[PDB]
Symmetry: C3
Subunit: 450 residues, 3 copies
Amino acid sequence: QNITEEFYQSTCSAVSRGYLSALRTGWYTSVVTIELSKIQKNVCKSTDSKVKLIKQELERYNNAVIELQSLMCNEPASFSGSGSAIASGVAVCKVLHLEGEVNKIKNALLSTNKAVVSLSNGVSVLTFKVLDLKNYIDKELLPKLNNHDCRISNIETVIEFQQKNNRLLEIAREFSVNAGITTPLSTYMLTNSELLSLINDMPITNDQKKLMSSNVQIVRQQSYSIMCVVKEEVIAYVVQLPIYGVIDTPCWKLHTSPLCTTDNKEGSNICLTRTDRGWYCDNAGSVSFFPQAETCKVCSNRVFCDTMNSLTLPTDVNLCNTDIFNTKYDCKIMTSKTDISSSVITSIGAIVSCYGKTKCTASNKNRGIIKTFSNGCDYVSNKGVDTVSVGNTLYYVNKLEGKALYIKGEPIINYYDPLVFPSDEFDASIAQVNAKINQSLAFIRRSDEL
Amino acid sequence: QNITEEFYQSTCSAVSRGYLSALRTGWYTSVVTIELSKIQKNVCKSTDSKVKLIKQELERYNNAVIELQSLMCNEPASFSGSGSAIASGVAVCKVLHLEGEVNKIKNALLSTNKAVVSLSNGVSVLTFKVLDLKNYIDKELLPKLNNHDCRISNIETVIEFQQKNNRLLEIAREFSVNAGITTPLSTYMLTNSELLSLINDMPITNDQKKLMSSNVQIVRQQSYSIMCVVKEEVIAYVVQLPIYGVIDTPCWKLHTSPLCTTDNKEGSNICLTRTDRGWYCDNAGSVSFFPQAETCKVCSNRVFCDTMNSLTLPTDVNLCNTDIFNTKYDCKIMTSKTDISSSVITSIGAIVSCYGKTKCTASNKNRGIIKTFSNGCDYVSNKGVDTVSVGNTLYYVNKLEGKALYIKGEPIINYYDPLVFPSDEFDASIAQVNAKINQSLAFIRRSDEL
Amino acid sequence: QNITEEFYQSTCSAVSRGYLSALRTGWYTSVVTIELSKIQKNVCKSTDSKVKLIKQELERYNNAVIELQSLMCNEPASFSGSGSAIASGVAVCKVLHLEGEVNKIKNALLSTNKAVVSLSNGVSVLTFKVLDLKNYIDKELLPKLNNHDCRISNIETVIEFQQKNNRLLEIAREFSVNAGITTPLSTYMLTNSELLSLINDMPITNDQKKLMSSNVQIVRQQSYSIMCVVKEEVIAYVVQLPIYGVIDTPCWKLHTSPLCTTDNKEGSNICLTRTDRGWYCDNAGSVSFFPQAETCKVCSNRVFCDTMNSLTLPTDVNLCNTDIFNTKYDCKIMTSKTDISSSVITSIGAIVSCYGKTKCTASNKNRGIIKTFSNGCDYVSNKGVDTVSVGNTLYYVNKLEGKALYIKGEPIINYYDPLVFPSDEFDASIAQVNAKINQSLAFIRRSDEL
Ligand SMILES: *[C@@H]1O[C@H](CO)[C@@H](O)[C@H](O)[C@H]1NC(C)=O
Ligand SMILES: *[C@@H]1O[C@H](CO)[C@@H](O)[C@H](O)[C@H]1NC(C)=O
Ligand SMILES: *[C@@H]1O[C@H](CO)[C@@H](O)[C@H](O)[C@H]1NC(C)=O
């Protein structure tokens, strides 16, 4: 009733079921501002111990401003091809290159720290001001020093200026090594207290807000931070947040391992494996498939993915899990005579493909080995199991507890004849190999009757 | 006259033209030094609030010096195989393991911060001294504390010593997690003010200097920082800068998408796609091709790549863009019966390969959908277009404005017979498939005349 | 007698021998604790320059504690599939979700900073307390401020509190961007002085301790740091250390390059290359093979790898280096008609595959070019050589000095007939291609006798 899993002996593949979706659908674009107090090198050289320390701590304020301005060639019109997810925010970086749009933003920021601004393109973008140093320099630092005859207040304005400017240092220190775009969204670019404020104000239901509130760090993983322009005493940069629109549909992850024969001599055995491994979720009737599991993040029962790196597949694709020889969907597989033992760790278990003189075993935490694996594709539920060894490689099984079901079946590699079996197929399918069988056997059928 | 692009309907491929090259040709090697004032634990235990704070801030000065010395096994003679770009700087890390060469460098640094040094190998390497603490400890910190009866000046020498030593902390904090080699060149290893000083002094023309001056962050992306030795009160480490020698030649990026038929039943259709996708540039007559676009960085009109991860190709390779059936160059393609819809975002447009009941569309910012795609390979210019949907996947098109040209043609997948079409070819070519056609048809031609 | 290498002309492959193993065998799990002094917002608003600075420096102490608590969904039961190396530490993160186990740990930490704790699962895990702020706030910060009528001592308790809390900031600043698991083990999570203390106390021989002591940074590369729970004024997180069990066996790295013919017209030549390239080491009789060299780290004579990303292979696999046509082990190769020039840098040399009008050369540091390469697969020892050019690509050879041996032989690509040669084989073998030859020639043998 929580997290289940079923292993198919016929196909040497396992499916872990019970997960819930949270797919990235849109890009919540937003801009954060930093007020500035641009002053030139009018320094009064009263070389005192309380004056030079502010000279050092403000020269870093100078290196961390002109540096952001040189990063202007990213990205007005570059990034050809991939990485097209930031193009929803690059549309905002291009708006900030327009006169009057910069000024129209500084308006509603000097009175409430946050407000929605109407632009030239008109996109309803929110605005923030996370650090204000124009109001800390032109009111606290400039008047006591510029016209009051070079009067430094004390030493607590040197430590506080260090901590009020430390946030700006570690941002230019981060943007310069990232060509203007950072990911994940580091706490320097947005602390935890500020992010939870922006999520409550997104054009989304109260449901998705609770999700991104208790799962903060996952929102960071799939968020960006682009650098636009620096002009008119304002630092302008855009941060993209994921808009989860496909939520609460079921998900399941497919696990596959090679399935070979053990009734031949050395390399005279034949193998096959199901290709399309990874995460599958329901996305309005059709099935969204995520090949590289590197784009999906798992958090307890939740699965967060980006639909950009996904193949869209029809609902009739679940048939490969049971009846792989169905006429509606043609299931993809690969074939080879390469006979190598291997193991695959799943959600609540492990698949073992043992072939040859390989020492394949599953061991227990306390009493050592508990099951020696014979040759062939086998599976074991993690109940009481902790480690699995295959030759000189040892794996640990995730001790997430769940109900694992074994589905016995005739391994479909036996339904094939080794003579007319394809030597190697990269990404073939059931129909493509039965056609290649009907092709190689087409010569033997119509030539030996002489 | 600025940035153009042309789509070939015959080949289901698009070429974006108008870019300008900037290829990494050489490795400007350089060494940066740090003077040290090695003092032993002769601490006067006058446990005062202004004494223990310097004890803490100098114990970090101790952890961040002995730590760099343990990182000596990288890289005197390791790194077998790949990563051979640092071998121009490792040649300098091996020179610093020689007596007398270390001393000969400390000479011209205590009087001008920078000078060229003749070595034992003799490579004209430049030298820098970005942070001097031997002159800040043995002159400011040591005399007031060691022999003046444990006399701490004040508290401004605790904050300034914090900021004068903070740079050393975040370097050993970075080298220890990077095994002695960091990339990109972080501002900790070299700030913006110091890098722009070294570029003006490189054995290059005034042209490449302006390039690396307005495109600083890109130079960082393709730069390294190796750790050599720590001895004789000196921290020694080498930083490699890219020497761009192939500059201002034209470049173009190739985009490809599957091209299939829609005149058969389910999987009875045939597909083909052009393999060699990516960046191409002119490099002295021949064409330098960059397969993994991850090694190329785009900055407006400029394209920066590393010629180490490039295939060198003859000039007669541009023929695949137009006349793919040319006798001079044999164009590479792959074939498959896999019929999956997909989209490819280009520079100023998007290619759509729509097959089956897939919902393929291009949508507008304001008025929603503007063109439904039929089955087959199609292209759309980004003029007024903003998004493209393929099933459950949505892409954003780069709104870089340019002149896109459509080149209509007969899709070459129709010139093939589905019976004698290769089931799957990984990286074949026109000649290799016409030979395999002339092979499969060789049996049907000389056996049915009975 | 130190580092050797031999190139096989018959196979266009080189083997670098003389390296010594250090394979990751087990996971030394350990937990580090941080005592806390949880106080609520009972701040006395005596807005003084020495009071507000501690308010700022302690509000960061608040953001860096509640932030770690939201990262609780990683990883109680997630991470489906890959990344199963932390499951030895996740077993400890699951123990910390149990009442009484948290309290039983705080015992032996308030008196000796370190002791072994018996748990509910009972795993003998060590414990540490690297930073104590419960004893710095409830004894130094709380009594002077809470009940002594809001009395701030001085300003040296603001700088020291900055440096005593700076370590906690850059950890939550690192865990939040890493979803609770960081790698490599940064010095923030464990400084050099503390790591060398834990290695001396591992259930290992005195040998492996010296290894991980002079090779510290490599131990960091293959170590993790998981985040468990935050409760009862204690920060709990687990760090995994590698247990090297397979040590001091010989290792060798295989290098391969395409081997083609130069006796045909354009693409009428045939090529083949040995597939399984990378690191091989001895692991109890059998041979542990590491395909992706990205999992192996080289440090002088030592080679550190993780046996999780390794194929286990029989001892009879060294035969492919000499007699590739042996009956005991079937050597894997790939074939293609693609005739592209390329070079491969090895340990103490370089392999060059020169084909077509490609300009292939090896150049010297002083006197330029020293050997022009003819068409075919050739090798050169690094004695006096520094660079190798292939078309527009230039490589640097590692100037590690050693004894390179040339083993001349008949290139095995000539023993094949171009008519019945496979157009392309992804990962075939000698037997699989001789069978495909015995298949294509099976028709010509039994059909032309008419
Ligand atoms: C193979 O050919 C037979 C006729 O001999 C036919 O009945 C069968 O359906 C064919 N199979 C495929 C997969 O085309
Ligand atoms: C295929 O064979 C025919 C002869 O029947 C020949 O004219 C043609 O050039 C051949 N094509 C190839 C690609 O070899
Ligand atoms: C190929 O067939 C011949 C018989 O004509 C046999 O002697 C030889 O061993 C076979 N080779 C292979 C690799 O099967």
